[PDB]
Amino acid sequence: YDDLSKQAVSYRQISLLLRRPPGREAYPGDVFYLHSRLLERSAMMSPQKGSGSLTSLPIVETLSNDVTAYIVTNVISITDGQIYLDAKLFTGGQRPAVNIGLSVSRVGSSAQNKAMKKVGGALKMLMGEYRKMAGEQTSG
Amino acid sequence: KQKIGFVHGIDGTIATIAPAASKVTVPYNTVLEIAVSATNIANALVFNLEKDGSIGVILLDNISEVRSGQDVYATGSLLKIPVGFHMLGKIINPLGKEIPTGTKLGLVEEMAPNIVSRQPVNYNLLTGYKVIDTLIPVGRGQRELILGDRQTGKTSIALSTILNQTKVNNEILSKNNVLSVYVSIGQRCSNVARIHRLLTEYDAMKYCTIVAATAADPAGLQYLAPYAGTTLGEEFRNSGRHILLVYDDLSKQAVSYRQISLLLRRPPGREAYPGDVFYLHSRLLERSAMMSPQKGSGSLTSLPIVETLSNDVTAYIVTNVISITDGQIYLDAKLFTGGQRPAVNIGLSVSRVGSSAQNKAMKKVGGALKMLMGEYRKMAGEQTSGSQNVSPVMIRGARCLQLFNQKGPSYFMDAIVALYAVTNGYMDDVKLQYSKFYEFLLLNKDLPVLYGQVNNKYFYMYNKNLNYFIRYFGLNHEILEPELKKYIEIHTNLFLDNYQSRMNELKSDEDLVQLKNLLYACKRTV
Amino acid sequence: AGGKRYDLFGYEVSVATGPFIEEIKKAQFYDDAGEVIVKMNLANTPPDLQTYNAVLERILNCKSKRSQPVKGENKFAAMMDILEEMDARSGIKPNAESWGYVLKELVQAGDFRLGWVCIAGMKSLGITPDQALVDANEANAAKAKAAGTDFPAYLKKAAPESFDTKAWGI
Amino acid sequence: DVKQVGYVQQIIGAVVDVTFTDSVPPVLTALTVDAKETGTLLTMEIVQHLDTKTARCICMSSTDMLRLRTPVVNTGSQITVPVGEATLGRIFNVMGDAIDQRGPVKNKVRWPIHRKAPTLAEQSGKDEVLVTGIKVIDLILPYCKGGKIGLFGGAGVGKTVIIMELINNVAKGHGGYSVFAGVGERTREGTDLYLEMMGSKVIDLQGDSKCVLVYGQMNEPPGARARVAQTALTMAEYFRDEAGQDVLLFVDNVFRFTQANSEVSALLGRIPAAVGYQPTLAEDLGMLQERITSTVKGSITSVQAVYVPADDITDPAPATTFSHLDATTVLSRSVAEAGIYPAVEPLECASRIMDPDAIDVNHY
Amino acid sequence: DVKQVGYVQQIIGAVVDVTFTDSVPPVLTALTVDAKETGTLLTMEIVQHLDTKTARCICMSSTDMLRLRTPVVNTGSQITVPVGEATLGRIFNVMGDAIDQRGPVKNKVRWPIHRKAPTLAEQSGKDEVLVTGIKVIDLILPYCKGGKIGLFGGAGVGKTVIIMELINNVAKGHGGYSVFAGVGERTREGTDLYLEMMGSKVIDLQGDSKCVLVYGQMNEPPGARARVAQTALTMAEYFRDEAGQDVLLFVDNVFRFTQANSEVSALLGRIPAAVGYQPTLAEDLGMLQERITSTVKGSITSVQAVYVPADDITDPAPATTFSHLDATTVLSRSVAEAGIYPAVEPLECASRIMDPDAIDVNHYNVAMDIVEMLTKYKELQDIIAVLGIDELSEEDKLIVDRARKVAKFMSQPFAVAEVFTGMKGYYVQLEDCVSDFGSLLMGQCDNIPEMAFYMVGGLDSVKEKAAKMAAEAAAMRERARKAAEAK
Amino acid sequence: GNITGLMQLADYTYNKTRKELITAELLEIIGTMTAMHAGKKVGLKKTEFW
Ligand SMILES: Nc1ncnc2c1ncn2[C@@H]1O[C@H](COP(=O)(O)OP(=O)(O)OP(=O)(O)O)[C@@H](O)[C@H]1O
Ligand SMILES: Nc1ncnc2c1ncn2[C@@H]1O[C@H](COP(=O)(O)OP(=O)(O)OP(=O)(O)O)[C@@H](O)[C@H]1O
Ligand SMILES: COCCOCCOCCOc1ccc(C(C)(C)CC(C)(C)C)cc1
Ligand SMILES: [Mg+2]
Numbered sequence A: 001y002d003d004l005s006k007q008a009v010s011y012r013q014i015s016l017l018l019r020r021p022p023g024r025e026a027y028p029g030d031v032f033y034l035h036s037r038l039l040e041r042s043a044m045m046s047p048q049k050g051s052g053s054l055t056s057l058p059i060v061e062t063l064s065n066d067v068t069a070y071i072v073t074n075v076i077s078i079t080d081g082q083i084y085l086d087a088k089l090f091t092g093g094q095r096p097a098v099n100i101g102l103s104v105s106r107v108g109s110s111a112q113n114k115a116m117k118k119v120g121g122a123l124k125m126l127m128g129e130y131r132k133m134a135g136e137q138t139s140g
Numbered sequence B: 001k002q003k004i005g006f007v008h009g010i011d012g013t014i015a016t017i018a019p020a021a022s023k024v025t026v027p028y029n030t031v032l033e034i035a036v037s038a039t040n041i042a043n044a045l046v047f048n049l050e051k052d053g054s055i056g057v058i059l060l061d062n063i064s065e066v067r068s069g070q071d072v073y074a075t076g077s078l079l080k081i082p083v084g085f086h087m088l089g090k091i092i093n094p095l096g097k098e099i100p101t102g103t104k105l106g107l108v109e110e111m112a113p114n115i116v117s118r119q120p121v122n123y124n125l126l127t128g129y130k131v132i133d134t135l136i137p138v139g140r141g142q143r144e145l146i147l148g149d150r151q152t153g154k155t156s157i158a159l160s161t162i163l164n165q166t167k168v169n170n171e172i173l174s175k176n177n178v179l180s181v182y183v184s185i186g187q188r189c190s191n192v193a194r195i196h197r198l199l200t201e202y203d204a205m206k207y208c209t210i211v212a213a214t215a216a217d218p219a220g221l222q223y224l225a226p227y228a229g230t231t232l233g234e235e236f237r238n239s240g241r242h243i244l245l246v247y248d249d250l251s252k253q254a255v256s257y258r259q260i261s262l263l264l265r266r267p268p269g270r271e272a273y274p275g276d277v278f279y280l281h282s283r284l285l286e287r288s289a290m291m292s293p294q295k296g297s298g299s300l301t302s303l304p305i306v307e308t309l310s311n312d313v314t315a316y317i318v319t320n321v322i323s324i325t326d327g328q329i330y331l332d333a334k335l336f337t338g339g340q341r342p343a344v345n346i347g348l349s350v351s352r353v354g355s356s357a358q359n360k361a362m363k364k365v366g367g368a369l370k371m372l373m374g375e376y377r378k379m380a381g382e383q384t385s386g387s388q389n390v391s392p393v394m395i396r397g398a399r400c401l402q403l404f405n406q407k408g409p410s411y412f413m414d415a416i417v418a419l420y421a422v423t424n425g426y427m428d429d430v431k432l433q434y435s436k437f438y439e440f441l442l443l444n445k446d447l448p449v450l451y452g453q454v455n456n457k458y459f460y461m462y463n464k465n466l467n468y469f470i471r472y473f474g475l476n477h478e479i480l481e482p483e484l485k486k487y488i489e490i491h492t493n494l495f496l497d498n499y500q501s502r503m504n505e506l507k508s509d510e511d512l513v514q515l516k517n518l519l520y521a522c523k524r525t526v
Numbered sequence C: 001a002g003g004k005r006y007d008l009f010g011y012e013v014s015v016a017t018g019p020f021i022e023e024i025k026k027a028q029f030y031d032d033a034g035e036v037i038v039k040m041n042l043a044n045t046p047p048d049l050q051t052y053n054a055v056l057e058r059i060l061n062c063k064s065k066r067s068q069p070v071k072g073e074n075k076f077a078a079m080m081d082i083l084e085e086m087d088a089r090s091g092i093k094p095n096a097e098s099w100g101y102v103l104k105e106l107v108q109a110g111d112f113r114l115g116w117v118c119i120a121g122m123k124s125l126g127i128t129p130d131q132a133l134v135d136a137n138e139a140n141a142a143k144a145k146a147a148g149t150d151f152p153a154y155l156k157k158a159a160p161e162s163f164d165t166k167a168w169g170i
Numbered sequence D: 001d002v003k004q005v006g007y008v009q010q011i012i013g014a015v016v017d018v019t020f021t022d023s024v025p026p027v028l029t030a031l032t033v034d035a036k037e038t039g040t041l042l043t044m045e046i047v048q049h050l051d052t053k054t055a056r057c058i059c060m061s062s063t064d065m066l067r068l069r070t071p072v073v074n075t076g077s078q079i080t081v082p083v084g085e086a087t088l089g090r091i092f093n094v095m096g097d098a099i100d101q102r103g104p105v106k107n108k109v110r111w112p113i114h115r116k117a118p119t120l121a122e123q124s125g126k127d128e129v130l131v132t133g134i135k136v137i138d139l140i141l142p143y144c145k146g147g148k149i150g151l152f153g154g155a156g157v158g159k160t161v162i163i164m165e166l167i168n169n170v171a172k173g174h175g176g177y178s179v180f181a182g183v184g185e186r187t188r189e190g191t192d193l194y195l196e197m198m199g200s201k202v203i204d205l206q207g208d209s210k211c212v213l214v215y216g217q218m219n220e221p222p223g224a225r226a227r228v229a230q231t232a233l234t235m236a237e238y239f240r241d242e243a244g245q246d247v248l249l250f251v252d253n254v255f256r257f258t259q260a261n262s263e264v265s266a267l268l269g270r271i272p273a274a275v276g277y278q279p280t281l282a283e284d285l286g287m288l289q290e291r292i293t294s295t296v297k298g299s300i301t302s303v304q305a306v307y308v309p310a311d312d313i314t315d316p317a318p319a320t321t322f323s324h325l326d327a328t329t330v331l332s333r334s335v336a337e338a339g340i341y342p343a344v345e346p347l348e349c350a351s352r353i354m355d356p357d358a359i360d361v362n363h364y
Numbered sequence E: 001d002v003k004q005v006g007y008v009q010q011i012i013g014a015v016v017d018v019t020f021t022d023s024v025p026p027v028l029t030a031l032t033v034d035a036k037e038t039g040t041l042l043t044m045e046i047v048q049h050l051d052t053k054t055a056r057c058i059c060m061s062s063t064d065m066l067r068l069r070t071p072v073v074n075t076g077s078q079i080t081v082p083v084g085e086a087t088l089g090r091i092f093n094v095m096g097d098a099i100d101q102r103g104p105v106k107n108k109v110r111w112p113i114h115r116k117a118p119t120l121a122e123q124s125g126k127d128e129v130l131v132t133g134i135k136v137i138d139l140i141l142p143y144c145k146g147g148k149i150g151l152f153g154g155a156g157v158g159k160t161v162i163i164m165e166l167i168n169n170v171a172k173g174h175g176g177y178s179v180f181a182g183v184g185e186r187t188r189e190g191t192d193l194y195l196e197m198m199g200s201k202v203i204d205l206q207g208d209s210k211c212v213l214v215y216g217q218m219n220e221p222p223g224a225r226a227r228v229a230q231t232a233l234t235m236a237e238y239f240r241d242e243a244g245q246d247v248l249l250f251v252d253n254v255f256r257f258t259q260a261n262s263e264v265s266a267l268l269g270r271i272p273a274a275v276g277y278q279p280t281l282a283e284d285l286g287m288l289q290e291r292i293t294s295t296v297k298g299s300i301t302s303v304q305a306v307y308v309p310a311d312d313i314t315d316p317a318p319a320t321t322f323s324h325l326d327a328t329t330v331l332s333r334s335v336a337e338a339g340i341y342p343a344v345e346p347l348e349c350a351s352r353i354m355d356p357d358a359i360d361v362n363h364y365n366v367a368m369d370i371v372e373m374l375t376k377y378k379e380l381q382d383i384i385a386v387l388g389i390d391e392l393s394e395e396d397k398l399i400v401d402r403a404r405k406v407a408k409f410m411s412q413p414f415a416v417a418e419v420f421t422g423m424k425g426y427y428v429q430l431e432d433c434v435s436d437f438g439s440l441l442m443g444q445c446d447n448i449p450e451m452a453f454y455m456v457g458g459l460d461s462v463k464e465k466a467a468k469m470a471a472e473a474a475a476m477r478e479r480a481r482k483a484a485e486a487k
Numbered sequence F: 001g002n003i004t005g006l007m008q009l010a011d012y013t014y015n016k017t018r019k020e021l022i023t024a025e026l027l028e029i030i031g032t033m034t035a036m037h038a039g040k041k042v043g044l045k046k047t048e049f050w
Helices: A004-017 A031-039 A068-076 A114-133 B130-135 B154-169 B189-201 B225-238 B249-263 B278-285 B318-320 B335-339 B360-379 B394-402 B414-421 B437-444 B467-473 B480-505 B509-525 C018-026 C030-041 C049-061 C076-089 C096-109 C113-124 C133-145 D134-141 D159-172 D187-199 D228-241 D254-267 D283-289 D317-325 D335-336 E135-139 E159-171 E185-200 E228-243 E254-268 E283-290 E316-321 E333-337 E360-382 E394-409 E430-441 E459-486 F003-040
Strands: B005-011 B014-019 B030-034 B044-049 B055-059 B071-080 B078-084 B105-107 B182-186 B211-212 B246-248 D005-012 D015-019 D028-032 D042-049 D054-059 D071-078 D081-085 D109-112 D148-152 D180-185 D211-218 D248-252 D302-305 D328-330 E005-012 E015-019 E031-032 E042-048 E055-059 E071-074 E080-081 E109-112 E150-152 E178-183 E211-216 E246-252 E299-306 E327-328
Touching: A004 A031, A004 A068, A031 A068, B071 D054, B078 B225, B105 B225, B130 B360, B130 B394, B130 B414, B154 B182, B154 B189, B154 B246, B182 B189, B182 B225, B182 B249, B189 B211, B211 B225, B225 B246, B225 B249, B225 B278, B246 E316, B249 B278, B249 B318, B249 D283, B278 B318, B278 B414, B278 E254, B335 D148, B335 E228, B360 B414, B360 B467, B394 B414, B394 B437, B414 B437, B414 B467, B414 B480, B437 B480, B437 B509, B467 B480, B480 E316, C018 C030, C018 C049, C030 C049, C049 C096, C049 D328, C076 C096, C096 C113, C096 E327, C113 C133, C133 D335, C133 E246, D005 E109, D015 D042, D071 D081, D109 D228, D134 E071, D148 D317, D159 D187, D159 D248, D180 D187, D180 D228, D180 D254, D187 D211, D211 D228, D228 D248, D228 D283, D254 D283, D254 D317, D283 D317, E015 E042, E015 E254, E042 E254, E055 E211, E071 E360, E080 E228, E109 E228, E135 E360, E135 E430, E150 E159, E150 E316, E159 E246, E159 E299, E178 E185, E178 E254, E185 E211, E211 E228, E228 E254, E228 E283, E228 E299, E254 E283, E254 E316, E283 E316, E299 E316, E360 E430, E394 E430, E430 E459
Parallel strands: B182 B211, B182 B246, D148 D302, D148 D328, D180 D211, D180 D248, D248 D302, E150 E299, E150 E327, E178 E211, E178 E246, E246 E299
Antiparallel strands: B005 B014, B005 B071, B005 D042, B014 B055, B030 B044, B030 B071, B044 B055, B044 E005, B078 B105, D005 D015, D005 D071, D015 D054, D028 D042, D028 D071, D042 D054, D081 D109, E005 E015, E005 E071, E015 E055, E031 E042, E031 E071, E042 E055, E080 E109
């Protein structure tokens, strides 16, 4: 899904023209049920139902690196993980501009294969120390 | 007569009319007349005509005297007011009603001139201050803003701009005169009266008039006043005459429009304003223009005033106005508190268009001072008390900012030479504090003629008619250069030998006080 | 007048100016002439050099600015603002007759120091002044030298050696 | 001659709506109802017409036990207040009913409250100085007659001893009386101020008193507090015009007068524009301040305390209040801890009249 | 045949309601009322229907002297405006009525202003760099021929001057028809521009012209500002489709188109959005933007300016407008306070063409570094303003001395601002910009002072400025020497 | 002297954003109140129907 903020902006454009009551940040208020109705359809079916699935990678625009707005908070509330792209890192030269400390995934080892488990289990422990020391200018 | 209906309801200033049984049409933006009493008649403006014949109205006069059962007459006419040369020398309610002290009906609401009727400004407008005519030029057409926090020196600049033009308009023809108008939105009635007595003291009232709308007056009237002053300007504009216009102040107009829009439950916007507040100022400010020769080559200048807060230009109204104006003048309470008066900040100020019109005598000098201050603002900031220096730039800067400290309007001839001395380093031997008394000793007094040194031929300061030669030729001409340089070289040698040595010699504390009284008096008279 | 004048936008103007020069010459107060220019620019009839020169003649012959007097009215600055209007604003440049009226006014006004500047300003532009005027200029300068009126009297008055806000006349 | 009568039609808090059957009375008109039904007197000021026979009005006292369609009397005018020498040394509420218990008041006339501000002619552009008697104020912060003055000071800084000295000096120097206007005043501070005004002989009950007192308290609804400064200001304008002399009009924190009118406007259904203050901020304030101006017939000075909420001058109520002021008399607990009294900090203070164009040069 | 006729119902500002007895026309249809009653002609487009036998509408010209029961004539079509070569070198209003007083335009056909956007099949995003001559625009945010450009900046930052500098560099050096839409801006600017074009023979009236001007300015009511850019796009789309020729669309500026719809939606009864803008912001902006698209027939290189009230990017209108743009140009005010003009903030800026596939490799590897270094300098500004330069490691104060050089080098003087800076305008070529930044990036020029990079173009001009500075410093040393010896 | 400038700049941004937030809460509330009343606006409608 491209920008879901635009899927809420259209919902606002409609409800407000329909003389519905606004809410926080001019939305109707029930937009959380909008994104929940959308995203909870994303799932891994049981083997009874063919063991199929569908992953959702919704994209949400952000303004000035805030996660305090209404829509961003209602979406992060629903989604398992999140991939924070910081402009301060994008403009910092590195691309893709993910900030690992801010970005998480609530699945973990159970998703990736047998080989990536043993690696990422070391990479997390690595970054836990590098994030604490990389703030130091290298003098040694 | 007509009796379209009767006042259903009132909410302070806004009101609502209900129609008569014999329903009749009324137009939009018409002035209505409420029969308040047997003889007293209010005046009110339409803003919407609804389905059932019910009409919304904005009240302007005698709101306290209104009731519900009263009658309502319609003129079938726009919001008009009288206008002409006979209106000059008077102070009026925006609706044309003259206020006391001790035929030609022009429209209030009107469209501005198109691109073809307009023209790039060519002629200057002397504010009388050296800071402005030098670095921030102002032409007859350049609607320029005057920012600054409360109690900063805003209200006095427009006055000084008018007082400077009084000395000239008596001399020159009437065509090149600079009439003036001072619209006071929300300012205290005392300040307006003090201004009236001031302008009557210098006899500047004959070429001026005032449009009064205080805080005691209604809000819907404050919304209307600058349109009235602009109408009085539009008449002299279309008649080929040039004119000035002033607004004190738009920031208090927007509040009065916010009263009405919110009393009518219009949807607000950013910082509580409705959203059409930009169009409020555009209808006004776009009427300021140097008309084309096709239309008379008239003019209508506009010097609005706007109240910032804590020196924050990121406010809504301030930027809505800066997006309109052809300029900017940013006054700072830092400098006003720090002795510098006027408190112009040259970095945050600009005159986008007047440089095309700035006189060449003031232009070649202004480019030099612009270079000088461009260097001073770096040479003073980089060191930040790190390491002082004795350099001609940082010297001449401090010698020039003192000259910029001003109280009243300075003549053009009196304005140039005090700067010409500084750019050419003549005024570097003197100290900081003795630059003002140096200036007064140069302009009103003539040390060479006093001390007998009459080697010069004609160039002297005693006449003041020499201005209109400098205005035509420019000081950098071949003939005005040598007499100017010799006059200044003599004046400097005399000041440095006869006077300044005595000033350094004085040590009695009572003498120093007697001297500082003189310096502050030179600070005032100049 | 086969040549045609245009505006900055490219619009055509009407050089029919004679009637306005007649209305200028009939006037007997030199501010009414500026009001004729005001009645001229409106009709898309910008000024010719004959017009400004007639205006300078009118100021020279007129007795005052208006039916009633005004404080500090000077025929000189009024005769020099219109020259600035000629040169810079409109683009037309004056001629020998133009500056000649100004030098005539300075002679009649008795001022002499401004006269010599009008001389040097004339000559620097290649203009040939008339010696009949500059001779009377030097005559008034010799008189004002003889009467001590070469400068005002209040400048030759000695200054206060002591500093005082009142003694300095401020 | 007879008196008009109306009947209530709806009641929402202190806001009330009154139906009539004839030409509705004017705006700002008083409407009194007898005490037999409600149990006590009740006044209501008309603000907002609604039709050819309806009138919405703010109530000034408690509207409890007010029945619907009760009789409502039109006084024929707006709120009347006493004036005269009997006013002095006494305390008055908004309606002019004394709350001092000190017997009745022997007034001669009873003027209305919402007098329009002076015409431009009645003004006097000549800006004078009030010879105060305090060398700190006379020198650094010359209190300009007809002008609006600011005072910033909390507790333990002698804020009362200053105004008491100002009253005692104006009582003998300029030959003028004074008046205090406690808007939203803490009821305890009313006692501590009136007992000081008996201890300092400012109010000689057995003699001649100098100051009038007007206490609109916090326990009163905002419909009263918004009309308190107009009451005291009428008590002052009577001494301005008829007696022909200078006057002081002291005021409690103007922020509470603005909060009062803001609650009135919010109650009436009007949208609050900004942070929470009414849209009529500058106009409601200006109707007060513009009545405070020098005249050919006399003068009215206005000392005013201010509470800057969260020390933010950029808030609309302080800044809009500052635009009318002429001087700023700051008080500091530092100098008061250094034994200095009056506890003035002349540096941070300022004045508008610091110009030799107005005053003598050597003073400047 | 007969023209349908109706009667007015109510009037609120520019908004009007109309009662058509028999039936209502479609949406966007025009409604003319005679100049007899109001005094001047007046067109009113429908925008919505309240009930049957009714239609709410917006008015172009003023509603003054308008009554409640006036007759309303139906055109039977939308707002039609002329097109063709006759529209070249002429000025027009929102309705296509000319105002230049030159003569009657010899139009042949008239097209409507409201039109559905092109289909996906027609579009063709071709990446071709656009040499403006400007230095920062070339380096960081290179424009793209056929795309869109955005100049985001508050009041008094230098975007209208950026547009004049782009006209002087690109438009005359274009060989293609241009269009200039003034949407709520100074009438003075349109006059200065019509004169700057009438001087360069771009609007040579007695010959061939290569430009069109539309101007619905701030003086006009919002009914015109809300529908002027549509007219300009119609003039451009005619050249895009029929002639199949590259064109330019300079717009100054769309925020007033947005204000116009905001001042309208309030009056129509629409409930507003958060700050107070219309709820139809994204749609009303998209129907304007998506008409600007490069097809196979032609291409439209638009250059739009945008206003940001209170210097607030969180304003929904610019915040919505970023998405529609191929190359953003985020101006700032704190930079202009530092003497730099153009006051670009390249960390905020962005583009689409910035890929090695489109532009050459050196330009990309250089700009990626330039952004990186300024990104570090921003992090250090929070410390240097606290402590100072002396409290930093030698690596850090080096990077500062290099980034101050870069940021100062990003400035240059334009030919338009000769009145302001008093310096001749430079035209920095693309290749010399990359060779200069690459040399400055590898420390090829570190001994050179900081001020030599200020307000200049090309490293040769830098080293001549450094020569002048060293010469003046030595001259002041000889002068202080002789002043000391004589003293 | 530098920390104080940064401090006052932050005190202004904080005290200004606090005001814009208060005003925004008022706009949201009044928008909901005005929408409810405008939609719930009741009229007599004394017009012919037969
Ligand atoms: N050019 C000047 N030189 C010296 N002092 C000045 C000058 N201009 C103004 N002042 C001083 O500023 C004070 C008046 O401020 P001013 O009237 O400019 O504020 P204002 O803009 O009117 O404020 P507001 O608009 O809120 O009334 C006076 O004390 C006056 O002496
Ligand atoms: N190269 C330059 N040299 C000097 N000044 C410049 C330069 N470029 C831009 N400026 C400055 O930019 C300002 C003009 O701003 P501009 O006209 O772009 O604002 P604007 O777009 O009209 O504002 P709005 O969009 O609100 O109308 C002037 O102060 C001008 O000096
Ligand atoms: C030239 O004449 C100037 C006279 O001006 C009269 C009004 O003066 C304005 C002073 O206003 C202020 C502003 C801020 C403050 C501070 C910040 C000291 C008040 C505080 C500490 C209570 C927040 C005090 C007074
Ligand atoms: Mg612009």
